[PDB]
């Protein structure tokens, strides 16, 4: 509800922007498909299997609303997105592999922010 | 505008096309080419009404919306003889599995 | 000349443009000269086939919207036999 | 696979225009060449949709799977949107062969269990049983594309 210390908010945005603007070795923006969830009337089987749905838009919304109170609270929601992606989608598919790299990029972005 | 016609004379059917702006006389020339009978020896009909040579097909009632390639308009033809349109053969009774 | 005569099993003659009759490979093979007799195809079926030739010539490789070729349920089977025979 | 969508980065706005009396099933070929059914279009309706340059589309009758034309051809490939302007995809009926048109009519009036009870030539039963499908046409359109690419 109330705003978190400005350093924390700036730290949260720096990590999320690094994860969203990330380009893999092939030069692709991996976050693109994870920005917005599939529509409930478009893929209802998603909301049937995924009990706690989340996307990069919902994560960015929780930073500005100050719903996350720490870098851990932010990490838990990014791990959940990647886990949900790895649950619904088949192993070996491009989307599945893309969620592995994004999850790793988050850990690297978090560690670089902690070092500063 | 193009009109699609079925010219009927007894057991003869000519399938042809023309313009709405084309005359009855012009249609008679097409019939002349096929059936080798001069336009003076010809009588053309629409819904059993005789058609004047000077009139366009559009003036006679033949329109593109009603004279379609897949549903041509009927043109009655008689020679220098009563206008006679002989019915075609009939399909069999519709099968029970098609009912 | 520009027209061919197709005669039905029951005696009816159908005079169509050469271009229209050429839709059928079977008719090409069959082509008094410019006259083709069908001992198996009746007049209600042959008429529909000629309407199909007109429809096909007019709408093939044309930019305009294409309407449905109508087929009443009662002729469907005989028209199926004739089209398979004529290869059109 | 010859017939597949390329991994395009270029977005393309398309006008899917149903100028046919059939309910249209839009079919997107994915990156593996696999057919993906998209939302159907009622007769005489248009949808502005978001696609990609180099993506592959096919159009079928949603109830029977009969093949349809799009801009007078079988395959639809979105091109460049000149100054944002969308690409017009005109979906029409093809000029079906009289034999195919007849097969569609008989299939629409007879349930499959009764095909063999029709008074027709033995071969026409197998022709009725051979229902149109995307995959059958995909093989034929693959060969035509290879032949074009070779010449």
């Amino acid at each position: 509800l109330s705003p978190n210390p400005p350093k924390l908010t700036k730290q949260m945005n720096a990590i999320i922007d690094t994860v969203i603007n990330y380009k893999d070795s092939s030069g692709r923006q991996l976050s693109e498909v994870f920005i917005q969830l599939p529509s409930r009337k478009e893929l209802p089987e998603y909301y049937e299997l995924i009990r706690k749905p989340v996307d990069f838009k919902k994560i960015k919304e929780r930073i500005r609303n100050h719903k996350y109170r720490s870098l851990g609270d932010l990490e838990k929601d990014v791990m959940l997105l990647c886990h949900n992606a790895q649950t619904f989608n088949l192993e070996g598919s491009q989307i599945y592999e893309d969620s592995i790299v994004l999850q790793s990029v988050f850990k690297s972005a978090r560690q670089k922010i902690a070092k500063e | 505008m193009d009109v699609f016609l079925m010219i009927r004379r007894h057991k003869t059917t000519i399938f042809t096309d023309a313009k709405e702006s084309s005359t009855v006389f012009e249609l008679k020339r097409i019939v002349e080419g096929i059936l080798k009978r001069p336009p003076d020896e010809q009588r053309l009909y629409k819904d059993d009404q005789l058609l004047d040579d000077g009139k366009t097909l559009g003036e006679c009632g033949f329109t593109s919306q009603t004279a379609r390639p897949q549903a041509p308009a009927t043109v009655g033809l008689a020679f220098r003889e009563a206008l006679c349109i002989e019915p075609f053969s009939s399909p069999p009774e519709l099968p029970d599995v098609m009912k | 000349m520009m027209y061919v005569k197709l005669i039905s099993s029951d005696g009816h003659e159908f005079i169509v443009k050469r271009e229209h009759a050429l839709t059928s490979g079977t008719i090409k093979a069959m082509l008094e000269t410019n006259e083709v007799n069908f001992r198996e195809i009746p007049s209600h079926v042959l008429s529909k086939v000629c309407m199909y030739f007109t429809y096909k010539v007019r709408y093939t490789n044309s930019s305009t919207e294409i309407p449905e070729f109508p087929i009443a349920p009662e002729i469907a089977l005989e028209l199926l036999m004739a089209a398979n025979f004529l290869d059109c | 696979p010859v017939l597949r969508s390329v991994n395009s980065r270029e977005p393309s706005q398309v006008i899917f225009c149903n100028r046919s009396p059939r309910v249209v099933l839009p079919v997107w070929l994915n990156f593996d060449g696999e057919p993906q059914p998209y939302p159907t279009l009622p007769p005489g309706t248009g949808r502005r949709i978001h696609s990609y340059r180099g993506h592959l589309w096919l159009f079928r009758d949603a109830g029977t799977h009969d093949g349809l034309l799009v801009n007078q051809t079988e395959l639809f490939v979105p091109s460049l949107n000149v100054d944002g302007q969308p690409i017009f995809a005109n979906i029409t009926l093809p000029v079906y062969t009289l034999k195919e048109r007849c097969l569609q009519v008989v299939r629409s009036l007879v349930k499959p269990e009764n095909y063999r009870r029709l008074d027709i030539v033995r071969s026409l039963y197998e022709d009725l049983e051979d229902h149109p499908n995307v995959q059958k046409d995909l093989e034929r359109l693959t060969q035509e594309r290879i032949a074009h690419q070779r010449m």
Side-chain angles (χ1 to χ4, degrees), chain A residues 2-6 8-9 11-39 42-44 46-47 49-50 53-66 68-111 114, chain B residues 2-48 50-64 66-79 81-99, chain C residues 3-31 35-38 40-88, chain D residues 1-82 84-112 114-115 117-121 123-125 127-135 137-143 146-147 150:
Chain A
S2 58
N4 276 101
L8 183 141
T9 314
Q11 277 166 201
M12 279 177 173
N13 288 320
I15 296 156
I16 209 67
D17 292 338
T18 296
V19 174
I20 293 169
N21 299 320
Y22 176 77
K23 278 191 198 72
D24 82 319
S25 51
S26 73
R28 296 173 312 119
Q29 206 207 271
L30 307 188
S31 70
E32 187 184 37
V33 280
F34 306 101
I35 295 301
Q36 196 173 105
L37 277 163
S39 183
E42 247 35 64
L43 187 65
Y46 194 86
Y47 299 93
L49 189 90
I50 307 303
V54 67
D55 57 31
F56 280 125
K57 205 183 168 178
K58 188 58 78 180
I59 290 168
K60 268 201 164 185
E61 190 221 278
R62 284 162 165 154
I63 301 167
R64 63 214 196 211
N65 283 10
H66 320 273
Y68 308 126
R69 310 302 298 185
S70 60
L71 298 178
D73 293 8
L74 174 64
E75 178 141 51
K76 237 77 182 177
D77 253 43
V78 176
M79 299 303 118
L80 175 72
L81 179 154
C82 298
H83 175 85
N84 291 345
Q86 278 154 46
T87 301
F88 195 81
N89 298 279
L90 288 142
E91 215 173 314
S93 77
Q94 202 51 243
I95 183 149
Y96 182 106
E97 296 294 332
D98 284 0
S99 74
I100 300 278
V101 189
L102 281 171
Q103 192 183 303
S104 181
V105 167
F106 182 94
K107 297 179 186 194
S108 293
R110 149 142 228 197
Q111 279 181 72
Chain B
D2 281 326
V3 287
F4 293 86
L5 319 166
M6 228 207 295
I7 303 163
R8 301 280 292 105
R9 192 256 173 175
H10 186 230
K11 293 181 78 174
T12 302
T13 305
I14 292 157
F15 286 81
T16 193
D17 61 87
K19 292 197 178 294
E20 283 191 354
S21 68
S22 71
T23 64
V24 158
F25 186 76
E26 269 149 4
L27 188 56
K28 284 181 169 189
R29 283 213 80 199
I30 305 313
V31 178
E32 179 177 44
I34 291 154
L35 299 180
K36 317 291 182 183
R37 299 287 222 96
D40 54 45
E41 287 187 38
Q42 296 182 38
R43 274 186 164 233
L44 292 176
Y45 301 87
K46 195 195 185 293
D47 317 305
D48 325 317
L50 187 74
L51 309 173
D52 298 298
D53 285 358
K55 284 197 170 193
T56 60
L57 296 174
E59 209 168 339
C60 299
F62 306 98
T63 66
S64 295
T66 53
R68 295 287 71 216
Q70 71 285 4
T74 304
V75 178
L77 172 72
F79 288 129
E81 184 212 299
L83 161 72
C84 175
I85 296 173
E86 262 254 58
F88 291 159
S89 42
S90 298
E93 180 185 18
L94 184 82
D96 179 49
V97 295
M98 293 191 71
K99 291 171 180 148
Chain C
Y3 286 87
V4 312
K5 195 190 279 155
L6 305 170
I7 301 104
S8 69
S9 64
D10 56 313
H12 286 267
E13 296 172 352
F14 295 92
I15 301 156
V16 295
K17 282 173 219 72
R18 193 167 283 269
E19 171 176 29
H20 298 225
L22 293 180
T23 305
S24 171
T26 305
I27 289 171
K28 292 191 192 75
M30 283 163 162
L31 285 169
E35 275 187 49
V36 174
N37 259 270
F38 300 98
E40 206 190 9
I41 308 170
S43 62
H44 66 290
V45 180
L46 191 44
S47 62
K48 192 60 162 194
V49 168
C50 299
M51 290 176 209
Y52 176 77
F53 297 150
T54 308
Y55 168 96
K56 191 270 173 194
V57 164
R58 171 65 193 94
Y59 291 112
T60 293
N61 283 285
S62 76
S63 301
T64 52
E65 194 192 319
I66 294 166
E68 196 92 79
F69 185 78
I71 294 164
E74 298 68 28
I75 44 101
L77 301 175
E78 290 169 297
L79 191 68
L80 178 62
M81 302 263 245
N84 187 61
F85 174 74
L86 298 163
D87 185 34
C88 59
Chain D
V2 182
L3 295 174
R4 66 173 196 90
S5 282
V6 90
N7 279 287
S8 178
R9 301 294 316 143
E10 296 189 85
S12 181
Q13 279 181 53
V14 185
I15 306 303
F16 277 178
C17 185
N18 187 9
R19 308 178 167 277
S20 115
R22 325 284 194 86
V23 175
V24 169
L25 175 72
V27 180
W28 180 61
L29 296 174
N30 68 18
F31 313 113
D32 312 289
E34 311 165 287
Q36 304 303 319
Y38 264 65
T40 67
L41 311 179
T45 69
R47 298 288 137 81
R48 188 177 58 88
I49 66 88
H50 297 94
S51 190
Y52 293 88
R53 269 194 71 174
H55 277 199
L56 297 197
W57 292 93
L58 280 141
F59 299 90
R60 312 299 283 193
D61 180 325
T64 62
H65 265 64
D66 302 323
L68 286 161
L69 287 180
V70 53
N71 303 323
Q72 297 169 69
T73 186
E74 287 143 305
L75 302 153
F76 180 64
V77 200
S79 49
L80 200 274
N81 275 354
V82 62
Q85 187 186 135
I87 301 308
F88 205 23
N90 304 311
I91 302 122
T92 68
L93 279 171
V95 179
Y96 296 117
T97 65
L98 186 61
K99 192 199 163 155
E100 202 39 54
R101 180 56 193 143
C102 283
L103 292 164
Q104 291 165 14
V105 169
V106 179
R107 283 172 195 139
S108 85
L109 298 164
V110 184
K111 68 182 170 181
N114 293 152
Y115 287 169
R117 295 180 200 269
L118 299 153
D119 188 22
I120 49 161
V121 159
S123 71
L124 296 165
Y125 297 144
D127 291 305
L128 277 161
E129 284 174 341
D130 189 34
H131 283 231
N133 69 103
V134 173
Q135 285 97 327
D137 290 313
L138 280 169
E139 301 170 310
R140 175 185 54 87
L141 294 161
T142 287
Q143 282 129 44
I146 296 162
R150 283 198 309 238

